[PDB]
Amino acid sequence: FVQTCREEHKKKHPDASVNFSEFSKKCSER
DNA sequence: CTGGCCTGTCTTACACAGTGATGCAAATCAAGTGTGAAGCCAGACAAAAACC
């Protein structure tokens, strides 16, 4: 799932390179 | 008593196995280095899986 989540968020966060720990937490929380 | 004529030894022809040498084409080396391609790192965590 995590790849798809991050791919969707590529536009959600306009140009940010997101953290590993926090992105894990977010994909986890959904 | 002597052939023709239906049968196992004899006699070389003949292919070729394989020897160390040979000869030519094609890698290879050697130097310079800046790339690009590639597997790996870390941490919180959840899938797809088998164990009581």
UniProtKB/Swiss-Prot annotation:
Motif (Nuclear localization signal (NLS) 1): 9-25
Entry's induction text: (Microbial infection) Protein levels increase upon infection by human coronavirus SARS-CoV-2.
Effect caused by changing S28A: Greatly reduces phosphorylation, nuclear localization
Highest taxon listed in the record's lineage: Eukaryota
Isoglutamyl lysine isopeptide (Lys-Gln) (interchain with Q-?), cross-linked positions: K10, K25, K26
Disulfide bond annotation, renumbered to this chain: C5-C27
Modification type Cysteine sulfonic acid (-SO3H): residues: C5, C27
Residue numbers carrying N6-acetyllysine: K10, K11, K12, K25
Location(s), subcellular: Nucleus; Chromosome; Cytoplasm; Secreted
Tissue: Ubiquitous. Expressed in platelets.
Outcome, altering S17A: Greatly reduces phosphorylation, nuclear localization
PTM note: Phosphorylated at serine residues. Phosphorylation in both NLS regions is required for cytoplasmic translocation followed by secretion. Acetylated on multiple sites upon stimulation with LPS. Acetylation on lysine residues in the nuclear localization signals (NLS 1 and NLS 2) leads to cytoplasmic localization and subsequent secretion.
Residues found modified as Phosphoserine: S17
Further information: Proposed to contribute to the pathogenesis of various chronic inflammatory and autoimmune diseases, and cancer. High serum levels are found in several inflammatory events including sepsis, rheumatoid arthritis, artherosclerosis chronic kidney disease, systemic lupus erythematosus (SLE). Seems to be implicated in other diseases characterized by cell death and damage, including diabetes and Alzheimer's disease. Its nucleosome-associated release during secondary necrosis may play a role in SLE.
Its job: Multifunctional redox sensitive protein with various roles in different cellular compartments. In the nucleus is one of the major chromatin-associated non-histone proteins and acts as a DNA chaperone involved in replication, transcription, chromatin remodeling, V(D)J recombination, DNA repair and genome stability. Proposed to be an universal biosensor for nucleic acids. Promotes host inflammatory response to sterile and infectious signals and is involved in the coordination and integration of innate and adaptive immune responses. Nuclear functions are attributed to fully reduced HGMB1. Associates with chromatin and binds DNA with a preference to non-canonical DNA structures such as single-stranded DNA, DNA-containing cruciforms or bent structures, supercoiled DNA and ZDNA. Can bent DNA and enhance DNA flexibility by looping thus providing a mechanism to promote activities on various gene promoters by enhancing transcription factor binding and/or bringing distant regulatory sequences into close proximity. May have an enhancing role in nucleotide excision repair (NER).
Entry's free-text remark on domains: HMG box 2 mediates pro-inflammatory cytokine-stimulating activity and binding to TLR4. However, not involved in mediating immunogenic activity in the context of apoptosis-induced immune tolerance.
Family: Belongs to the HMGB family.
Quaternary context: Interacts (fully reduced HMGB1) with CXCL12; probably in a 1:2 ratio involving two molecules of CXCL12, each interacting with one HMG box of HMGB1; inhibited by glycyrrhizin. Associates with the TLR4:LY96 receptor complex. Component of the RAG complex composed of core components RAG1 and RAG2, and associated component HMGB1 or HMGB2. Interacts (in cytoplasm upon starvation) with BECN1; inhibits the interaction of BECN1 and BCL2 leading to promotion of autophagy. Interacts with KPNA1; involved in nuclear import. Interacts with SREBF1, TLR2, TLR4, TLR9, PTPRZ1, APEX1, FEN1, POLB, TERT. (Microbial infection) Interacts with adenovirus protein pVII; this interaction immobilizes HMGB1 on chromatin, thus preventing its release from cell and subsequent inflammation activation.
Name recorded for this polypeptide: High mobility group protein B1
